[PDB]
């Protein structure tokens, strides 16, 4: 007589898996106990960050007239935003390349 | 077959379909997004663990997660992440 099984992601209105996040917190050796709201909060934060980066990368891809996001577009999105660049300052994106930037003294007169 | 290798790819793709319905993503970009999600998860969980240890608490709660988010994420990114987490937690609590 068990009720139809919902999911905690659906209860929280999230796309990221609350149950998987809770399992990873339990098995990650972070604490002896994990609160019920902790994986929900963490899944919401991860989803927000993913949505922000994917939004910026999709805008960059559209600007490049590409319909598919590529590591170059992820790199452009991350490096053109100061807060995301600060968050990922020490991170190397494979196949991301670099921002086009030439020092003004090097350009011809 | 082979042992199941769980990844965030399907959730990242759902988020992509929410934010930009008509665009797709390459496999390399999906791998980079998986690396990103894992790295941020590790950062937040480690900071929350440190906070709980400092406060002699055995339970990591949404308060620990919120404080970890404020410590790690900069400025407006942190503020919006806190708002998203709070909204999700309240919705979950209200079933």
């Amino acid at each position, epitope marked *: 007589a068990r009720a139809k099984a919902k999911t905690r992601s659906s209860r929280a209105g999230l796309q990221f898996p609350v149950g998987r996040v809770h399992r990873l917190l339990r098995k990650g050796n972070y604490s002896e106990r994990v609160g019920a709201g902790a994986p929900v909060y963490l899944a919401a934060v991860l989803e927000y960050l993913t949505a922000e980066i994917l939004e910026l990368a999709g805008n960059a891809a559209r600007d490049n007239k590409k319909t598919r996001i590529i590591p170059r577009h992820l790199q452009l999105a991350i490096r053109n935003d*100061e807060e995301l660049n600060k968050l990922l300052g020490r991170v190397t994106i494979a196949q991301g390349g670099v921002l086009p930037n030439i020092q003004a003294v090097l350009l011809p007169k | 077959k082979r042992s199941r290798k769980e990844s965030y790819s399907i959730y990242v793709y759902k988020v992509l379909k929410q934010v930009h319905p008509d665009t797709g993503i390459s496999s390399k970009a999906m791998g980079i997004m998986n690396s990103f999600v894992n790295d941020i998860f590790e950062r937040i969980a480690g900071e929350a663990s440190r906070l709980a240890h400092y406060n002699k608490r055995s339970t990591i709660t949404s308060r620990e997660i919120q404080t970890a988010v404020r410590l790690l994420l900069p400025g*407006e990114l942190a503020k919006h992440a806190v708002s998203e987490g709070t909204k999700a937690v309240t919705k979950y609590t209200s079933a």
Partner: single-chain antibody
Amino acid sequence: MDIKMTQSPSSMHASLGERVTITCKASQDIRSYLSWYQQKPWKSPKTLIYYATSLADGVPSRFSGSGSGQDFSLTINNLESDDTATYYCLQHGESPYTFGSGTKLEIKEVQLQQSGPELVEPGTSVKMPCKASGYTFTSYTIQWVKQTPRQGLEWIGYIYPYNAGTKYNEKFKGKATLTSDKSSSTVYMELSSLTSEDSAVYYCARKSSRLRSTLDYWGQGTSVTVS
């Protein structure tokens, strides 16, 4: 192809204490990137709601917003004396930002320093500064808005001091030019080929690079008048 924003009530008379709603219809899907602004006469607009549901910092819980996709609403519950003003919706889901016509309701620290009024003859050029203080200058874009009684508020363009990136409304390409000064934390707007049409109050506004972030703090406005 610009998203026109349609405010249904152009004016409203209401008594004290009673509830008031203001409806906004978007021409195209803006995907929940809508904000609401309150402007008392001869003063700069203050933000009320952002992301179509979220209260701005310091805004009382009396104000509330709802809606998504194309249709949005603003609500005020406990009407108080100060609530008499003009309310503008602003969408920023697409690159040319668009303001609403403005509902005139009548009832029974981050600092942006902006220059004073300017009197200029046609054809000459004017340069309005924007001294910003109270926050880390490079992290937030500076947005420029032109207000005319005949055409309302228009988004001109923005400067990102982090990388000097620019974007302009097509109506202001060439007419407007934006520059920044990291050393003095100042932004300058340049107008070329001045015309009587350019007689308007120009507001500098701060907006984070976050997409759901809206125009939060505004300068006092420079009243440029063309003879």
